[PDB]
Amino acid sequence: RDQEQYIHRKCYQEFAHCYLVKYKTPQPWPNEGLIADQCPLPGLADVSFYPYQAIWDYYAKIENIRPANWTSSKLYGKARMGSYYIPKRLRNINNTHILFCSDVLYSKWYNLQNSILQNENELTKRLSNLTIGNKLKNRALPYEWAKGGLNRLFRNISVLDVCSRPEMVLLLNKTYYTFSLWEGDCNITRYNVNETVPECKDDHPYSCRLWRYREGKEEVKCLTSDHTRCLYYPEYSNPEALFDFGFLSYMRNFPGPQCIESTSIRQQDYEVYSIYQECKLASKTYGIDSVLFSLKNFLNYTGKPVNEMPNARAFVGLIDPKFPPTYP
Ligand SMILES: *[C@@H]1O[C@H](CO)[C@@H](O[C@@H]2O[C@H](CO)[C@@H](O[C@@H]3O[C@H](CO[C@H]4O[C@H](CO)[C@@H](O)[C@H](O[C@H]5O[C@H](CO)[C@@H](O)[C@H](O)[C@@H]5O)[C@@H]4O)[C@@H](O)[C@H](O[C@H]4O[C@H](CO)[C@@H](O)[C@H](O)[C@@H]4O[C@H]4O[C@H](CO)[C@@H](O)[C@H](O)[C@@H]4O[C@H]4O[C@H](CO)[C@@H](O)[C@H](O)[C@@H]4O)[C@@H]3O)[C@H](O)[C@H]2NC(C)=O)[C@H](O)[C@H]1NC(C)=O
Ligand SMILES: *[C@@H]1O[C@H](CO)[C@@H](O[C@@H]2O[C@H](CO)[C@@H](O[C@@H]3O[C@H](CO)[C@@H](O)[C@H](O)[C@@H]3O)[C@H](O)[C@H]2NC(C)=O)[C@H](O)[C@H]1NC(C)=O
Ligand SMILES: *[C@@H]1O[C@H](CO)[C@@H](O)[C@H](O)[C@H]1NC(C)=O
Ligand SMILES: *[C@@H]1O[C@H](CO)[C@@H](O)[C@H](O)[C@H]1NC(C)=O
Ligand SMILES: *[C@@H]1O[C@H](CO)[C@@H](O)[C@H](O)[C@H]1NC(C)=O
Ligand SMILES: *[C@@H]1O[C@H](CO)[C@@H](O)[C@H](O)[C@H]1NC(C)=O
Ligand SMILES: *[C@@H]1O[C@H](CO)[C@@H](O)[C@H](O)[C@H]1NC(C)=O
Numbered sequence: 001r002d003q004e005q006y007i008h009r010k011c012y013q014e015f016a017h018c019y020l021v022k023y024k025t026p027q028p029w030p031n032e033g034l035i036a037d038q039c040p041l042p043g044l045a046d047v048s049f050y051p052y053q054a055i056w057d058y059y060a061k062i063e064n065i066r067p068a069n070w071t072s073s074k075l076y077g078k079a080r081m082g083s084y085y086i087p088k089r090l091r092n093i094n095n096t097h098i099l100f101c102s103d104v105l106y107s108k109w110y111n112l113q114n115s116i117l118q119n120e121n122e123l124t125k126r127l128s129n130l131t132i133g134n135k136l137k138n139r140a141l142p143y144e145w146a147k148g149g150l151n152r153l154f155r156n157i158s159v160l161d162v163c164s165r166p167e168m169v170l171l172l173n174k175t176y177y178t179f180s181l182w183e184g185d186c187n188i189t190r191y192n193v194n195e196t197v198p199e200c201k202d203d204h205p206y207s208c209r210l211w212r213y214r215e216g217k218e219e220v221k222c223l224t225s226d227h228t229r230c231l232y233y234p235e236y237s238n239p240e241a242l243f244d245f246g247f248l249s250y251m252r253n254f255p256g257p258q259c260i261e262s263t264s265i266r267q268q269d270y271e272v273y274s275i276y277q278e279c280k281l282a283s284k285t286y287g288i289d290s291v292l293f294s295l296k297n298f299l300n301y302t303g304k305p306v307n308e309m310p311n312a313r314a315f316v317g318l319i320d321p322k323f324p325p326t327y328p
Contacts, residue, residue, distance in 0.1 A: 006288065007279075007280060007283045007284075007288050008124065008280065010279075010283075010288055010292055011276050011279035011280050011283065011288075011291075011292075012120060012124065012276060014279070014292065014295070014296065014307065015101075015275040015276040015278075015279050015295060015299075015307070016103075016120070016123060016276050017101050017102055017103045017276075017311075018099070018100070018101040018274075018275035018276065018299065018306070018307060019099075019100055019101075019136075019272055019273065019274055019275060020097055020098075020099055020272070020273040020275060020321075020323055021097060021098040021099075021100070021172065021270050021271070021272050022096065022097050022270065022271040022272075022273075023095075023096060023097070023098070023266060023270065024266075024267070024268035024269055024270070024271075025266075025267070025268065026093055026094065026095060026096045027093075027265060027266045027267075028090075028091035028092055028093050028095065029086055029090060029091040029170045029171070029173075029176070029265065030091075030176070030263065030265055031078070031086065031176070031263075032076075032077040032078045032079055032085060032086055032091075033060075033076075033077070033078050033079030033080055033083055033084065033085060033086070034058070034079070034083060034084040034085075034086055034162075034170075034176075035080070035083050035084075035178040035179070035180050035182065035185075036055060036083070036084060036162050036163070036178075036179060037179050037180055037181050037182070037211060037245070037246025037247075037249070037250075038159050038160055038162075038163065038179040038246055038247055038250040039053050039055050039160075039162065039163035039246070039247065040053065040163075040243050040244040040246075040247045041056075041059070041082075041243035041244070042056050042059065042061075042243070043243040044241060049243070049244070050243075050244065053163045053164060054163070054164050054165065054166050054312060054313060055084060055162055055163045055164070055166045057166070058084040058085055058086060058087070058166060059083075059084055059085075060072065060075075060076040060079045060080070060081050060082065060083055060084060060085045061081075062081045062082055062232070062234050063232060064231070064232055065229045065230065065231070065232065066220055066230060066232040067220070067227065067228050067229075067230065068220060068222050068227040068228070068230050069220065070220050070230075070232065071218065071220075072218060072234075080182070080235065080236065081218075081234045081235065081236070082212060082234065082236060082238060086170060090167060090170045090171065090317075091170070092317055092319075094319045094320075095171075095317030095318060095319055096318065096319060096320050096321075097317070097318040097320075097321055097323070098171045098172060098315060098316070098317055098318070099299070099301065099306050099315075099316050099317075099318050099321075100168070100306065100314055100315040100316070101275075101299065101306045101307045101309070101311075101314045102165075102168070102311045102312070102314050102315065103311060104165060104168070104311060104312060105154045105155060105157075105168070106123075106153065106154060106155060107151045107152070107153065107154060107155040108155070109122055109126070110122065110123065124276075126140075126152065126153055127153075127274050127276060127277050128277075130152055130153055131274055131277045133277075133281065134273050134274055134275075134277040134278035134281060134324070135271065135272070135273055135274075136153060136272040136273070136274055138269070139152050140152045140153035140154065140272070141153065141154055141270065141272060142154060142155070142156045142157070144156065144174050144175070145172075145174065145269065145270045145272075146269040146270055146272075147269060157169060157172065157173060159177070159179060159250060160250075164312050165312050165313070165315070167313055167315040167316070168312075168315040171315050171316075171317060172315070173265060173266075174264070174265060174266045174267075175262050175263065175264055175265060176262065176263040176265055177260055177261070177262050177263075178259065178260060178261050179246060179250060179258070179259075179260060180246075180258070180259035180260070180261075181210050181211035181212065181245060181246050181249060181256075181257060181258065181259070182210070182211065182212045182214075182236060182259070183210045183212065183213045183214045183236070184214050185259040185261075186257075186259035186261070188210065188257045188259060189210075189214075190210060190213060193208050193209070193210070193256070193257050194208070196257065197255070197256060197257050199255035199256070200255055200256060200257075203254070203255075204253060204254035206242075206245060206248060206249065206253070206254050206256065207254045207255055207256055208255060208256045208257070209256055209257075210257055211238065211242065211245040211246055211249075212236040212237060212238050213236060213237050213239060214235070214236055215233065215234060215235060215236055215237050216233075216235070217233075217235065218233065218234060218235050219232075219233045220232055220233070221233065273323065275295060275298075275299075278295065278323075278324055279291055279292070279295055282294075282295075282324060282327060285327075286327040286328075290327050290328050291327060293328070294325045294326065294327050294328065295325065297325065298321070298323065298325045301318050301321055302316055302318070304316075
């Protein structure tokens, strides 16, 4: 009780929301380009109309002026300009586990409106119940992550999660679903929306319309003698420079087109370990000081501590880590 509540205090304040997901088979995010129209773009103005979207870190921004032989494949690989480039580091076939310290994935029983007393009580009570040792029972997870999943600990990831927790989605999503208003996708063109979209057959200005239109080939045209400052012509245009068209289409403000295609990324059940539960159990055998020291170094497996990262972004890949760690 005295040493149990002391171990709980230390284990909770440090590792309450820290978990280790093991992929059945190491499977990285399969594409270099991400189509996520549900997220608003940064916009041309100095001050954006939307608060910073973490996904903007991966934005393949179109610049109107580029050197004579500039192509998008130099910085953004196969990604479409105007959408997102997923860097090498977030699609590493060597990563076998996903370490994260975050409370953004809890289901409805956890929320800020509740006092910290209620949240802490309910989380430790669910962690005890939903674990065999330090391993979470399948019922704690979403069904998509593991068969028999009932969201008793973690909620399902949603369409907007990638806008604010991009690494969580790239690393944990079992399926990639596009959200697209790009002309050509799902065979929807500016000419056939009156046939592909049932709710349309001709109100909000954005009704029955695509966002980005198919222009043609990507090219750099040098009109003047300056060969370091030529006219860039992208494959697609944003004709009215709209930055939240897709976000408003998602938030169901009006009728019109939407293209949602799925790509299976990870197959087979995840294994999830609770680092608070591991802390609580290993401290009875090795002592709180060595368990706290060891689990802290485990959170620094990459050189940057995961518990010191912002909650929305504290999702990192590890290569064949030894868990539980060696306790001195
Ligand atoms: C990371 O992981 C996250 C977790 O998995 C993931 O989140 C999930 O994201 C997906 C993708 O956005 C979400 O699913 C979609 O939900 C759409 C909305 O559904 C509601 O509205 C519909 C419209 O009225 C209802 O039908 C629908 O009811 C159904 O679902 C209920 C549960 O939600 C269920 O209880 C009901 O019984 C019922 O079955 C619900 O109320 C939905 O519209 C969408 O469906 C399309 O896309 C699917 C995937 O490709 C297709 O399988 C499906 O058939 C639909 O495709 C059609 O429509 C598209 C346009 O919307 C077209 O592009 C397609 O080509 C296709 O169109 C053809 O067929 C039409 C008729 O079927 C026809 O009219 C057309 O002409 C054409 O022939 C899909 O289910 C999911 O809900 C999210 N999960 C959670 C928990 O939030 C996240 O996205 C991932 N992130 C990243 C970055 O990858
Ligand atoms: C999280 O995602 C899972 C899917 O992976 C959701 O579970 C599924 O939810 C649907 C809609 O409620 C269930 O469909 C219903 O099934 C009953 C019969 O079981 C049927 O009578 C209804 O007509 C309807 O089709 C589906 O059973 C269920 N699937 C599984 C495997 O559980 C879940 O609801 C999402 N969680 C939350 C909290 O949003
Ligand atoms: C651009 O490409 C052409 C064709 O390969 C080449 O001849 C030319 O020197 C390049 N321009 C510059 C400014 O390097
Ligand atoms: C994966 O590990 C192997 C062996 O150490 C290495 O050759 C390869 O470059 C690594 N891949 C990435 C994407 O770092
Ligand atoms: C977990 O909680 C449920 C709900 O009270 C209960 O039925 C179940 O027996 C509990 N499991 C354990 C390990 O006590
Ligand atoms: C788009 O058209 C091609 C045939 O030209 C077809 O194979 C493909 O499945 C269509 N896609 C959709 C989503 O309708
Ligand atoms: C994480 O490890 C690196 C060595 O790779 C070290 O420089 C850094 O101080 C460690 N962080 C902590 C909190 O000890």
